[PDB]
Structure formats: structure tokens, C-alpha cells
């Protein structure tokens, strides 16, 4: 027929936006699930990396299009809020964008699509929450089983009977039965080479990676300590500007050495006047953290020194110990010191790590550090990642209590209900919600295909079994078919499914609303 001439074509931008964004999602889609396919990337440095981790892939895909990049931010939001599902939030975004593209071709204005999808997302969340299996923080074993599940897909699963309760106790030490938001950044995972995977500890004050003092005269241990955090360097005067010292004999060398030593002595005496017992110096390569000459003075003062402490360790210390940074020896005073019952260096299988316990300070906050041990780098790196993910699982359970079955089950349950319920809606409401619900099946569809199963057969079985059955049914790659995934212990926190529904709506809403790209120069 004859219709809108469409001389000005804003749809050309939205089409470019959707095409670019969906391309990113389809690339990630094929890596979904324990049976997913690997991606290989050649980096700008020429290195070859292989991974099936969606977020790691997305960062290295080096997406250019200003709008397609937003799908990377979505995975970052998922990693920040939930810590899991980072691949699934982009995949659902891609499928929902495909729904939007079809709806646009059907004559639905992008404004209608964005708002209607938001309404569908609201109902999707309600459907998800009602169907979950509730948990309680009071049930320590239940928390261990939740962590143990996420640990069963790690490289060294034989120690999951240890890493699970470690993650559980680490959270419980700082989060009681009545908590909403737990920031697991207060649970510091500290690695050190040596020992074994089970050989871990939970420390209240801090675990540091560095030694204290090895030289003669050092106290090596202090009880009832006040602790300061140093960001300055303690070294003889060493300016950057032009300077010269002339020494023609040992007599002048003696004078010069006394000038250098007296400088450090005055610093060390002021530190003593502040009644500081332990110095924790932030790592820097500008000047010596604490010069040997200063260590001789500080040792005689019975002051412990820990050097080359990483920024991240310093930031944790400022919360666990109740102590404050000192920017310069000029301002080094008591008001900036914390407290601790015991500061000691532990040498276990050559560890030699300084730790603090018994802070008992009003400035302290519920923090905990975990000692990760292991012979090979792969052991301490795998353990840290394993505990981190386990902590993210528990954090999710606090924010929104409960787990749902995996294997695409909540996507079949939500889609199935929405497709039926949408039939009672009017106008664009029903037509759009049918496309929204259909988009959700990209997850159980992809899981079936990556598992080597017939795509239509599995989804057909999932539809039929959910109509007669319940959420517990889903795809099990271990059983290579549709079975009771709850009984197979394939469980994900509610927050992961809830967040994915939200992010998919927010991203598509954001993409559809962009009708132009302009430069600001």
C-alpha cells in the first residue's frame, strides 16, 4: 500500500544498534553451560587466550560500537550485584532485542516496546520469587550445601567439603541471621604459597602477605599494640633536585652519616612519642619503605615494621584495625592509631605472614580475612576464585532468600506462565508479552544445544513437564536430558534469576531509546 514515506529514517540507527548488540550476545551464547564451547581470542599483545567465562570474554572482545559495549556493562553489573549469571544476562538481552526487532517490524513503536517489556519484567520477577525454595541463615548445613554446589564445577572439587563451610563461616562471622546487604569485599582472601588447600584460617584483624622484620634486634612480635598505616617513606634525605655531598675522608663520612641517621632518629622518636607499636607501610618504589638505618632505630624502640603492603591490603586494614593513614611523619600522632591484642608473624611451611588479632576497637567494622594456602600457584589461585564465587552465592542468598532449580527451569516456568497469562491481556500487551516470553527460552534452548541434545525435543519435553510438573524439572548435562534438577542439586540463588530479568529489561529499554549518535568535540 501507500504509507509513511520515511524520508527521515531514524530506524536505521536502531537497526544498527540492535544488530551490533545481538551479535555480541550470540557470540557469548555458544559458551553457556558446563558443556558450552570455548572462545579463543588473540589479544593486542599477540597472546592467545582460551576461556568459556562470559565476562572475561566480553572484556577481551574489544567491542567498538558505542551501544553494543553496553552489553559488557550489563555483565559487569551482574558480576557486581550477584556474582553469577554474567553470561546469561547478556544472552537474555540478545534474545529480548530479537523480540524487539520483530515487534518493530510488526509495527510496534519502540516506545511501546520498551515500556511493555518493563511491565513483563515486573511479572517475571514475581513469578520467579514465588517458585523458589526458601533458605535461612540459621541453617549452617543448608548454606554449606549451597556453596558446595557452586564448588562442584571447580578444578579441584575434592576439597569442596572444606571450602564450602569456610565460605559459610566467613560470611556468618560478619553477617548474622538478620541482614539484607552483605558486602563481601569485607571478606579478604589472602593467598600465600605453601601448605595445602584445607589448611586455611579465618582471622578477625587482618592477614597480610608480607614479613615483618628479619634483622638482628627486631622484636618480631608485639602484644597489646597500637598500629598505624604509613603512606610515606622512611629513608635518609634523598631529594630529587640537583644535590652534591663531598667526602674526602672517613671523618666527613662520619659527619654525613650522623646527619642521615639523626634525621631518621627524629622520625623514629616521634613515632615512639605517638605510642605506635607496629608500622604498616604502603608499598611504593619511590623511596625505601623503611631504610635499614630506620629499622635499627625502630628495632631498639621495640616497634614492628611490615613493608611493601599492597594498596588493597592498606584499604582493608583501615576498616579491620580501626587505624587511620598517616600522610607524613609530620602528622604522625596517636589519634591515627588503632589497637590489637596480638601482632605476630606466622611461619607455617615457610609462610612467614604477619597477621593481627583481637582488634577490640570502636573504629573496627565486621571484617574477616581468610588464609589461602597451597603449594603451586594454580592451587592458591583456584582456591581464591572458588571461595570468592562461594561467597557470592551466599551474599545472593542474603539479599533475596532462596534458590531456584537450574537447567533453564525458571526460564521455562516464567515463559510458560507469561504465554498463558498474556492471552488475557488487551492490545499490544498480549502481542508483546508473547514475544517477551518466547525470548526467555534462549537459555534452555542454548543449554540443550550445547549439551549435544536435540533442540526441539528438549524444549518440547520442558514445556510438557512444566505444565504437569514443577520448577524442579530442567536440563541436566550430567544426565544428558530433562530430569529433576533439584534432586540433582543443580541450584542457583534467586538473586541471579531476579537480576537477569531486571538487567535484560534495563538494557533493551536503554538500547531501543537511542535514535541517534552524535559526537561532542
Amino acid at each position: 500500500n501507500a504509507t509513511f514515506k520515511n524520508k527521515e529514517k531514524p530506524q536505521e540507527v536502531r537497526k544498527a544498534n540492535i544488530i551490533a548488540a545481538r551479535s555480541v550476545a550470540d557470540a557469548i551464547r555458544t559458551s553457556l553451560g558446563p558443556k558450552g564451547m570455548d572462545k579463543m581470542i588473540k589479544t593486542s599483545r599477540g597472546e592467545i587466550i582460551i576461556s568459556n567465562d562470559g565476562h572475561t570474554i566480553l572484556k577481551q572482545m574489544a567491542i567498538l560500537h558505542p551501544v553494543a559495549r553496553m552489553l559488557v556493562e550489563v555483565s559487569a553489573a551482574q558480576d557486581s550485584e550477584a556474582g553469577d549469571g554474567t553470561t546469561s544476562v547478556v544472552i537474555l538481552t540478545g534474545a529480548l532485542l530479537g523480540a524487539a526487532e520483530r515487534l518493530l517490524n510488526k509495527g510496534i513503536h519502540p516506545t511501546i516496546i520498551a515500556d511493555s517489556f518493563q511491565s513483563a519484567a515486573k511479572r517475571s520477577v514475581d513469578i520467579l520469587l514465588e517458585m523458589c525454595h526458601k533458605v535461612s541463615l540459621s541453617d549452617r548445613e543448608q548454606l554449606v550445601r549451597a556453596a558446595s554446589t557452586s564448588l562442584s564445577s571447580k578444578i579441584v572439587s575434592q576439597y569442596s567439603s572444606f571450602l564450602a563451610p569456610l565460605a559459610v563461616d566467613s560470611v556468618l562471622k560478619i553477617s548474622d541471621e538478620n541482614s539484607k546487604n552483605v558486602d563481601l569485599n569485607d571478606i579478604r582472601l589472602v593467598k600465600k604459597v605453601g601448605g595445602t588447600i584445607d589448611d586455611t584460617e579465618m582471622i578477625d584483624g587482618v592477614v597480610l602477605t608480607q614479613t615483618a622484620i628479619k634483622s638482628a634486634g627486631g622484636p618480631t612480635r608485639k602484644e597489646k599494640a597500637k598500629i598505624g598505616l604509613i603512606q610515606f617513606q622512611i629513608s635518609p634525605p634523598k631529594p630529587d633536585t640537583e644535590n652534591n655531598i663531598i667526602v674526602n675522608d672517613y671523618r666527613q663520612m662520619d659527619k654525613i652519616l650522623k646527619e642521615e641517621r639523626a634525621y631518621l632518629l627524629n622520625i623514629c622518636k616521634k613515632i615512639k612519642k605517638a605510642k605506635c607499636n607496629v608500622l604498616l607501610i604502603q608499598k611504593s618504589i619511590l623511596r625505601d619503605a623503611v631504610n635499614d638505618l630506620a629499622l635499627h632505630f625502630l628495632s631498639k624502640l621495640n616497634i614492628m615494621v611490615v613493608k611493601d603492603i599492597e594498596r588493597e591490603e592498606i584499604e582493608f586494614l583501615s576498616k579491620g584495625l580501626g587505624c587511620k593513614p598517616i600522610a607524613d611523619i609530620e602528622l604522625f600522632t596517636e589519634d591515627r592509631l588503632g589497637s590489637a591484642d596480638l601482632v605476630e608473624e606466622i611461619d607455617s611451611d615457610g609462610s612467614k605472614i604477619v597477621r593481627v588479632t583481637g582488634i577490640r576497637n570502636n573504629n573496627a567494622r565486621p571484617t574477616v580475612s581468610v588464609v589461602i594456602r597451597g603449594a603451586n600457584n594454580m592451587i592458591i589461585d583456584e582456591t581464591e576464585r572458588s571461595l570468592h564465587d562461594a561467597l557470592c552465592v551466599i551474599r545472593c542468598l542474603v539479599k533475596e532468600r532462596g534458590l531456584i532449580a537450574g537447567g533453564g527451569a525458571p526460564e521455562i516456568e516464567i515463559s510458560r506462565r507469561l504465554s498463558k497469562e498474556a492471552r488475557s491481556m488487551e492490545g499490544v500487551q498480549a502481542f508483546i508479552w508473547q514475544e517477551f516470553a518466547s525470548a526467555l527460552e534462549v537459555i534452555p534452548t542454548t543449554l540443550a544445544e550445547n549439551a549435544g541434545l536435540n533442540s526441539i525435543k528438549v524444549v518440547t519435553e520442558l514445556r510438557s513437564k512444566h505444565e504437569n510438573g514443577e520448577l524442579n524439572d530442567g536440563i541436566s548435562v550430567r544426565r544428558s536430558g530433562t530430569t529433576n534438577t533439584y534432586e540433582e542439586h543443580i541450584l542457583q540463588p534467586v538473586l541471579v534469576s531476579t537480576s537477569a530479568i531486571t538487567l535484560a529489561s534495563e538494557c533493551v529499554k536503554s538500547i531501543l531509546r537511542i535514535d541517534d549518535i552524535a559526537f561532542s568535540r
Partner: protein
């Protein structure tokens, strides 16, 4: 007068572009909503306006859609003068660039 007649009508045509853009951005058929709205305001009922949430015509007093008188004076005043500034231009002269 004759010559100025089309300019006055053109001014009105510009004024009715805002409710057209409002409907279009809301994803509604602006041609229907704007044409019907005009017939409502023309044939008395001067209370009606766009319902940019339901996609229909509604009584703005019942919905509570009001805008400051002072602001509307500023918008009309600024738009009128803003056009005049460029209406008075028919030549662009540039000096040597630096």
C-alpha cells in the same frame, strides 16, 4: 491583511507541532490525537489535552496537568524573538580566519 495572512497561520502551525512531537515520542498516532484534540479545543471543551500514558484525549484538570503561566509566557516570547533573529538574516560574511 493579505500578505501577512499566511505568516499568521504559519505561526499557528508551528504552535501545534509541540503536541504532535509529544504524541510521536510517546509512540502514539499523532495525526489522530492532534487532529481530534484540535477539534475538541475548537468546539469549546477547552480543558482537554493529550494523555501521553493511555494514548487518548483527556481532561487536563482531572488529570492535573498544569504548567506555570510565567514559563509559558517565556517559551512563547523566547521562541518568537528567537525566530526573528534569524529571519532578519540573508547574508553571511566571514573575516580572514585566525
Amino acid at each position: 491583511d493579505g500578505k501577512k495572512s499566511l505568516a499568521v497561520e504559519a505561526f499557528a502551525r508551528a504552535l501545534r507541532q509541540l503536541p504532535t512531537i509529544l504524541a510521536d515520542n510517546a509512540g502514539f498516532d499523532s495525526s489522530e490525537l492532534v487532529s481530534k484534540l484540535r477539534s475538541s479545543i475548537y468546539n469549546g471543551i477547552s480543558t482537554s489535552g493529550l494523555d501521553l500514558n493511555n494514548g487518548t484525549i483527556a481532561d487536563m484538570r482531572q488529570l492535573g496537568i498544569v504548567e506555570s503561566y510565567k514559563l509559558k509566557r517565556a517559551v512563547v516570547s523566547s521562541a518568537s524573538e528567537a525566530a526573528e533573529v534569524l529571519l532578519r538574516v540573508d547574508n553571511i560574511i566571514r573575516a580572514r580566519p585566525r
